[PDB]
Ligand binder design. Structure first.
Ligand SMILES: [Zn+2]
Lengths: 189, 95, 346
């Protein structure tokens, strides 16, 4: 997250990549020479590195999906009817609108105009979902929902900052008594 | 096997002196066989040549800072970093 | 020359070497934070108010017609006091890339001490200067008219001789001199033969028709030329004119911090004499009508941590008051990554 040093190091590599994206490599391979063409796909970036390099605001924002520009609230009234619309060219364009502000808007209107893009996209990634952290996050989410079902919250809300800890104790004792599933403080796959 | 050079040499000379044969190969025959597997060994050529990219073909482990300005006057930097040149490393990965 | 340590709030991290401290009507504003504008403050421009030796980096919104500018790390900033406003040229965007844009900080609304800036931008034509940093721009007056002089500092290799094995290597620009009309935003480059070698991180001084350049690293040969240069700028009714003169009494220094203690009487606080010579002696530039009177004061009392460190940074809060920083302690790793100081030139 040392953005300056990170860009200092990775700028030449991105330069070379953009260069060799548009030529052909002649390489003698076992006798005859072959001509290779390349197609790069930056996809193995976790959610935080995607929001950083591509020039998005941190993960706690109102704009959640790094693939479609929808807000956390309206992502609850409507769960599955979206479509991928967060490219890299469009995000360079949105940063340009932000920095330029040609319509003379306020901060909280310009944000809406440019969908939480307030940084120049540094690397070209592709819209994807990171299956590893996707599954780990879903699992931690279900751990929490198990605790909240133990607390019977669906009838009486707003417990304390220690009733829920007691609920966690109930859950982890029951789990490392019915599965020998030792409790962990760091969720792992 | 994560052996080191002194340990590999121990094993080499011991197997050699016991068996009499030379089952393992000496260290320099491993450095030579290693030069063939890193990047910066094969001749390749791009077309059209790569803009802003060198044309040499023996470019190995470059310093990662890429000639970053490191004095007491520029933005301070002490992050040691090494890298390959992208094109030569990609060529090595293909061959 | 009373040095004083300073305490710092919760967003200490937002300070980095190469920042800027602008000054509007007696109040100071931090600019050029570390990393793209976080959501707490979308502009990076802060109230840099120090009270009881405790500073509160507070946010500050822009106007409804401004231009949100990226936090630059080594700009050239002059106080164009002609409506009071500041000029921003060049710098290293958080993505490590140089900007050619010029910005104009003004204050379009201030009520209940809530300042509303206005960061309009103006582009250049004609002999536009190469994107660069470490340089120094300054405004000059003549015949009522005014102009902006720009004597360049280092930059990146041009777009042809630039290779990825040396993608970040820098080179001093050509020692031209640029004149900039802010009205039309028109640039004009001038070759000056008495200036030969490039010069970055120097210290410029504007006195109402002249510019005293002094100090400054020279990357072309890695030396700090101790010769200072008076530029005289004349504004006829047609085309302007420039002249340069070497002068004696200069100082070999770079990355020095300037401020104006009295009228036409400046102080220059630590820079560097060598690649490892932490500068200590301060220098009084007692201006005059046409002559520069260099001198020195009693080397303001430096603590132990300032002597046992290697680098620093800072700027001038505006009223004979310099703000310095210093890196933390790596062997005393329970350090907050930076220690700070304000010292009053009084
Ligand atoms: Zn989505």
């Amino acid at each position: 997250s040392d953005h300056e040093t990170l860009t200092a190091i990775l700028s030449p590599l991105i330069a070379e990549r953009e260069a060799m994206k548009s030529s052909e490599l002649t390489l003698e391979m076992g006798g005859i020479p072959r001509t290779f063409k390349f197609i790069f796909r930056g996809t193995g970036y976790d959610e935080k590195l995607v929001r950083e390099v591509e020039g998005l605001e941190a993960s706690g924002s109102v704009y959640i999906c790094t693939l479609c520009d929808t807000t956390r609230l309206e992502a609850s009234q409507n769960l599955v009817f979206h479509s991928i619309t967060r490219s890299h060219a469009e995000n360079l364009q949105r940063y340009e609108v932000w920095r330029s502000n040609p319509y003379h808007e306020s901060v909280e209107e310009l944000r809406d105009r440019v969908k939480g893009v307030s940084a120049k996209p540094f690397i070209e990634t592709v819209p994807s979902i990171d299956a590893l952290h996707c599954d780990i996050g879903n699992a931690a989410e279900f751990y929490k929902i198990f605790q909240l079902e133990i607390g019977e919250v669906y009838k009486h809300p707003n417990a304390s900052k220690e009733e829920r800890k007691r609920w966690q104790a109930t859950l982890d004792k029951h789990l490392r008594k019915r599965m020998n599933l030792k409790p962990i403080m760091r969720m792992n796959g | 096997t994560f052996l080191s050079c002194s340990q590999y040499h121990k094993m080499y000379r011991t197997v050699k002196a016991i068996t009499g044969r030379q089952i393992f190969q000496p260290l320099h025959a491993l450095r030579n066989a290693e030069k063939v597997l890193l990047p910066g060994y094969h001749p390749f050529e791009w077309q059209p040549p790569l803009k802003n990219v060198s044309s040499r073909t023996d470019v190995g482990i470059i310093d990662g800072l890429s000639g970053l300005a490191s004095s007491v006057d520029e933005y301070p930097v002490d992050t040691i970093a090494k890298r390959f040149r992208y094109d030569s490393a990609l060529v090595s990965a293909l061959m | 020359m009373s040095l004083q340590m300073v305490t710092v709030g919760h967003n200490i991290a937002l300070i980095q070497p190469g920042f800027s401290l602008m000054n509007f009507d007696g109040q100071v504003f931090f600019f050029g934070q570390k990393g793209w504008p976080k959501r707490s403050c979308p502009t990076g421009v802060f109230h840099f108010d120090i009270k009881q030796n405790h500073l509160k980096l507070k946010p500050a919104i822009f106007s409804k017609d401004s231009c949100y500018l990226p936090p630059l790390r080594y700009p050239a900033t002059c106080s164009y006091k002609g409506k009071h406003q500041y000029i921003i040229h060049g710098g290293k965007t958080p993505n490590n890339e140089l900007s050619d844009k010029i910005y104009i900080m003004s204050v379009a609304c201030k009520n209940n001490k809530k300042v509303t800036f206005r960061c309009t931008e103006k582009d250049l034509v004609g002999d536009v200067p190469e994107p660069r940093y470490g340089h120094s721009i300054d405004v000059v007056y003549s015949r009522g008219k005014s102009m902006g002089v720009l004597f360049g500092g280092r930059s990146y290799m041009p777009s042809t001789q630039r290779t990825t094995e040396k993608w970040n290597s820098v080179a001093d620009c050509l020692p031209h001199v640029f004149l900039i009309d802010f009205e039309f935003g028109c640039a004009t480059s001038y070759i000056l033969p008495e200036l030969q070698d490039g010069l970055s991180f120097h210290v410029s001084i504007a006195r109402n028709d002249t510019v005293y350049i002094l100090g400054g690293h020279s990357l072309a040969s890695n030396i700090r030329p101790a010769n200072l240069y008076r530029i005289r700028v004349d504004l006829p009714l047609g085309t302007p004119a420039v002249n340069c003169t070497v002068l004696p009494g200069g100082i070999s220094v770079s990355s020095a911090i300037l401020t104006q203690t009295n009228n036409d009487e400046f102080v220059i606080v630590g820079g560097y004499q060598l690649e490892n010579q932490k500068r200590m002696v301060c220098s009084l530039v007692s201006l005059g009508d046409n002559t520069i009177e260099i001198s020195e004061m009693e080397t303001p009392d430096w603590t132990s941590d300032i002597k046992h460190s290697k680098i620093w940074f800072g700027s001038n809060m505006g009223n004979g008051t310099i703000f310095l920083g210093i890196p933390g302690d790596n062997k005393q790793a329970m350090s907050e990554a930076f220690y700070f100081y304000t010292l009053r030139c009084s």
